[PDB]
Amino acid sequence: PCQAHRTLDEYWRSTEYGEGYACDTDLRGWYRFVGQGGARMAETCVPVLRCNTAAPMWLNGTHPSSDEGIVSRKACAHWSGHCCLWDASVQVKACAGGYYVYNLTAPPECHLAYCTDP
Amino acid sequence: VSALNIRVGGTGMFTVRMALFQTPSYTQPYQGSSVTLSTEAFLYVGTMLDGGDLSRFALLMTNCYATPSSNATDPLKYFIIQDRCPHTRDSTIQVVENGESSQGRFSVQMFRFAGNYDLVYLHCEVYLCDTMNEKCKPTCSG
Amino acid sequence: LEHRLECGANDMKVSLGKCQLKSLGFDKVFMYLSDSRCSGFNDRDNRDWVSVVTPARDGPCGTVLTRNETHATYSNTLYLADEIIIRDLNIKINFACSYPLDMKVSLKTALQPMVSALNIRVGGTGMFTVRMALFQTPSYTQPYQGSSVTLSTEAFLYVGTMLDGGDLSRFALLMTNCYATPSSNATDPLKYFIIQDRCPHTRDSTIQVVENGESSQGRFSVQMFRFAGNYDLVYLHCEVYLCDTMNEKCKP
Amino acid sequence: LEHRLECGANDMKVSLGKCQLKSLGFDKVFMYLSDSRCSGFNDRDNRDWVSVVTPARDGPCGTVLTRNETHATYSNTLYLADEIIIRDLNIKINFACSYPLDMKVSLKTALQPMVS
Numbered sequence: 292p293c294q295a296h297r298t299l300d301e302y303w304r305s306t307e308y309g310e311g312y313a314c315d316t317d318l319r320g321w322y323r324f325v326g327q328g329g330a331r332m333a334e335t336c337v338p339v340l341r342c343n344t345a346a347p348m349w350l351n352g353t354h355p356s357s358d359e360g361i362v363s364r365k366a367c368a369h370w371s372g373h374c375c376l377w378d379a380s381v382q383v384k385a386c387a388g389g390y391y392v393y394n395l396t397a398p399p400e401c402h403l404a405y406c407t408d409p
Numbered sequence: 410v411s412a413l414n415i416r417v418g419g420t421g422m423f424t425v426r427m428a429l430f431q432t433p434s435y436t437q438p439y440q441g442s443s444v445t446l447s448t449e450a451f452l453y454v455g456t457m458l459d460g461g462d463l464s465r466f467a468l469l470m471t472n473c474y475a476t477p478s479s480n481a482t483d484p485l486k487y488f489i490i491q492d493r494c495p496h497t498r499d500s501t502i503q504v505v506e507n508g509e510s511s512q513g514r515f516s517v518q519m520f521r522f523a524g525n526y527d528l529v530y531l532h533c534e535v536y537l538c539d540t541m542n543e544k545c546k547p548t549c550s551g
Numbered sequence: 552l553e554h555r556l557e558c559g560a561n562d563m564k565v566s567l568g569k570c571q572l573k574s575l576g577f578d579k580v581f582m583y584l585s586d587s588r589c590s591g592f593n594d595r596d597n598r599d600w601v602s603v604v605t606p607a608r609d610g611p612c613g614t615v616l617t618r619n620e621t622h623a624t625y626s627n628t629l630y631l632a633d634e635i636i637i638r639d640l641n642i643k644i645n646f647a648c649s650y651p652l653d654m655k656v657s658l659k660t661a662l663q664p665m666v667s668a669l670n671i672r673v674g675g676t677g678m679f680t681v682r683m684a685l686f687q688t689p690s691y692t693q694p695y696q697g698s699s700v701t702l703s704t705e706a707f708l709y710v711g712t713m714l715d716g717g718d719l720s721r722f723a724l725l726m727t728n729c730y731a732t733p734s735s736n737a738t739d740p741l742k743y744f745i746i747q748d749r750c751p752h753t754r755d756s757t758i759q760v761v762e763n764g765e766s767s768q769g770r771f772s773v774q775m776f777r778f779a780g781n782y783d784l785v786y787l788h789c790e791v792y793l794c795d796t797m798n799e800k801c802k803p
Numbered sequence: 804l805e806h807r808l809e810c811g812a813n814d815m816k817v818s819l820g821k822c823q824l825k826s827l828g829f830d831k832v833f834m835y836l837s838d839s840r841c842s843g844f845n846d847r848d849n850r851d852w853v854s855v856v857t858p859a860r861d862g863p864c865g866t867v868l869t870r871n872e873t874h875a876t877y878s879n880t881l882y883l884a885d886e887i888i889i890r891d892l893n894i895k896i897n898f899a900c901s902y903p904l905d906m907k908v909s910l911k912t913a914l915q916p917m918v919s
């Protein structure tokens with residue numbers, strides 16, 4: 292968990308990036324978002340065509356604070372005008388310190404990717 | 410001592426590839442067959458060289474273009490890279506390394522051909538150069 | 552003797568079949584390249600074969616690079632011997648194969664853009680040109696230019712209609728019904744129909760029709776007549792219809 | 804904008820004022836039919852007009868034909884661009900004019916018989 296994870300230093304994942312086509316089907320494991328992109332995922336459904344993707348996704352609900360353990364959340368995906376139209380399963384865990392980890396699964400259909408709010 | 414000389418010959422093709430990169434800074438390749446973009450999106454493509462003798466040979470793009478079909482000799486061409494230099498009349502065109510090393514990359518804002526065309530293909534033509542025999546860096550100005 | 556050289560991307564392989572080298576007199580094959588350490592080995596692709604492998608570089612095993620404007624040639628020399636020391640006759644296979652320096656590469660993925668579009672719709676209408684003509688000679692081969700034509704009742708009367716408009720291949724000029732009226736206007740009450748309801752009015756035997764509704768032009772022949780009363784003017788008219796030559800037929 | 808379309812007896816043409824499109828922002832225009840070989844050209848009758856000419860038939864330059872029981876229509880799409888590549892504001896002028904199937908004809912010559 293907090294010690295066994297792969298970092299992602301990507302500055303194009305922020306909710307400010309123009310538009311891309313990247314889709315994350317090879318994302319496997321627990322990740323620690325690091326860099327100018329941000330440390331935590333999106334908390335509200337970000338508008339369409341952002342995060343270097345056509346249909347970005349977001350973590351629905353609120354992040355768990357310190358000392359919460361393993362939590363189950365369902366990362367919704369905004370597309371076509373109906374926020375959270377496809378669903379993916381994520382497992383967030385807080386960490387000792389100012390950072391998080393996520394169980395990043397593959398979205399059901401490609402041209403979906405996660406964001407990080409700066 | 411007398412010698413007998415048998416002379417034989419042959420021909421071979423180096424291997425040069427093209428790939429579409431899913432991210433800026435050209436990090437991961439694309440494993441799809443058709444990609445749907447918006448015209449406001451940038452395009453991040455590049456060429457590799459797997460043939461061999463990368464020490465003496467530097468990959469370099471003499472000319473690259475786009476055609477609305479798979480056919481590469483199509484009369485309709487938009488020269489993305491014209492005569493070893495990136496297009497200057499289009500501001501959204503930039504190259505990173507052309508002839509510097511064994512891999513060349515460039516980026517172009519996506520377009521769509523005017524008329525009854527709904528697809529855009531890409532084709533370059535590569536000219537390998539010797540790193541030490543001659544000077545390969547293309548530096549052009551208006 | 553058979554030679555097979557595969558000048559691959561980075562491997563230059565020279566091979567000689569041992570099944571023939573045995574019969575050639577070499578009971579044990581020594582396969583030295585220009586560098587004595589690039590000794591040959593055994594492989595089996597189509598049969599038991601001996602071969603050497605030299606990387607396609609500048610001097611990994613003695614290869615020498617010769618550069619031309621359009622090609623790069625990699626030169627080397629083989630060496631054969633039935634033992635370590637030769638006295639009878641040296642054997643050298645001066646093998647070399649060149650690569651090109653001008654290639655073409657194509658992106659293998661179709662790339663489809665999307666963009667917002669606006670569609671302004673503009674309409675209109677035109678008219679197919681159909682002109683009616685008078686023939687004063689048989690076989691329908693000579694038109695009449697004058698405005699006024701005076702001809703006896705007994706003599707026949709030949710009238711032709713021809714479609715001048717485009718798309719002649721797709722459209723055949725049908726002739727719904729013709730009539731003759733003693734006035735320029737087509738609204739006149741008393742009329743003399745020549746062809747009634749797509750087929751000729753046959754109550755008068757002096758009427759005959761040729762090539763009606765089959766080509767771009769139709770025609771008919773009808774005897775001259777005098778309207779009852781003090782009507783010395785006969786202005787005949789007709790209206791035509793167009794058929795789709797494949798969906799239906801215009802033969803009545 | 805302005806689009807004058809005259810549906811002639813044999814062929815149809817769509818014309819656009821050069822001054823109007825120059826003011827609209829197109830220095831040089833590319834008029835493309837359903838097939839790009841019907842590129843627009845220049846012709847002047849009362850002002851500068853850039854125009855396209857298409858035969859009024861089924862297929863000579865992509866003109867679709869769909870005839871119903873009473874009229875027959877010849878529909879072709881038009882494309883306009885200030886360059887070879889469109890990058891924003893793709894423009895399509897969907898033009899079509901229909902011809903009637905029922906027409907009236909009459910001789911222009913006065914006839915005069917006589918009976919003894």
Ligand SMILES: *[C@@H]1O[C@H](CO)[C@@H](O[C@@H]2O[C@H](CO)[C@@H](O[C@@H]3O[C@H](CO)[C@@H](O)[C@H](O[C@H]4O[C@H](CO)[C@@H](O)[C@H](O)[C@@H]4O)[C@@H]3O)[C@H](O)[C@H]2NC(C)=O)[C@H](O)[C@H]1NC(C)=O
Binds near residue numbers: 649
């Ligand atoms: C720079 O160097 C390149 C690489 O060598 C060179 O290309 C060579 O051109 C020569 C001249 O034509 C070719 O020489 C061969 O010589 C004999 C006849 O003299 C034949 O073996 C060849 O003809 C055959 O060519 C084909 C076989 O590959 C077949 O069509 C057929 O069998 C012909 O008979 C040929 O003439 C030599 O083969 C090529 N090298 C290749 C093709 O790899 C180039 O010309 C040089 N440029 C200069 C000097 O400006």
Ligand SMILES: *[C@@H]1O[C@H](CO)[C@@H](O[C@@H]2O[C@H](CO)[C@@H](O[C@@H]3O[C@H](CO)[C@@H](O)[C@H](O[C@H]4O[C@H](CO)[C@@H](O)[C@H](O)[C@@H]4O)[C@@H]3O)[C@H](O)[C@H]2NC(C)=O)[C@H](O)[C@H]1NC(C)=O
Binds near residue numbers: 872873
């Ligand atoms: C067979 O197909 C033909 C050709 O498509 C069709 O004739 C069309 O009829 C419709 C319905 O009347 C017309 O549609 C137009 O639609 C809008 C309004 O909805 C207007 O542009 C038109 O009204 C105009 O009418 C006059 C035209 O100048 C003017 O008074 C004025 O501009 C009005 O706005 C019109 O309603 C269409 O234009 C015609 N096509 C013509 C006239 O060429 C026909 O009805 C079909 N027959 C069938 C289905 O049985």
Ligand SMILES: *[C@@H]1O[C@H](CO)[C@@H](O[C@@H]2O[C@H](CO)[C@@H](O)[C@H](O)[C@H]2NC(C)=O)[C@H](O)[C@H]1NC(C)=O
Binds near residue numbers: 382395
């Ligand atoms: C995130 O957490 C889950 C739950 O611990 C990990 O394992 C999955 O557990 C469910 C429930 O039994 C299984 O159905 C899944 O098959 C498990 N996943 C795999 C890949 O086997 C899950 O792996 C974690 N995800 C990441 C991306 O690390």
Ligand SMILES: *[C@@H]1O[C@H](CO)[C@@H](O[C@@H]2O[C@H](CO)[C@@H](O)[C@H](O)[C@H]2NC(C)=O)[C@H](O)[C@H]1NC(C)=O
Binds near residue numbers: 480481482
């Ligand atoms: C690629 O495009 C050309 C042009 O459309 C195709 O047709 C050839 O056109 C050239 C002139 O451009 C003629 O000289 C040739 O005779 C045409 N035929 C051939 C077979 O070359 C050409 O066929 C297309 N190639 C492929 C592989 O589809």
Ligand SMILES: *[C@@H]1O[C@H](CO)[C@@H](O[C@@H]2O[C@H](CO)[C@@H](O)[C@H](O)[C@H]2NC(C)=O)[C@H](O)[C@H]1NC(C)=O
Binds near residue numbers: 738739740
């Ligand atoms: C052509 O002339 C006639 C005769 O003056 C005009 O009026 C028609 O007259 C006939 C015979 O009485 C009637 O059957 C028609 O109904 C009349 N048509 C009308 C009133 O519209 C006729 O209008 C003239 N036609 C034209 C096109 O001018």
Ligand SMILES: *[C@@H]1O[C@H](CO)[C@@H](O)[C@H](O)[C@H]1NC(C)=O
Binds near residue numbers: 351352365367375
């Ligand atoms: C995810 O959380 C959002 C934000 O409160 C909520 O609207 C949505 O219903 C949640 N998703 C599901 C599947 O309940």
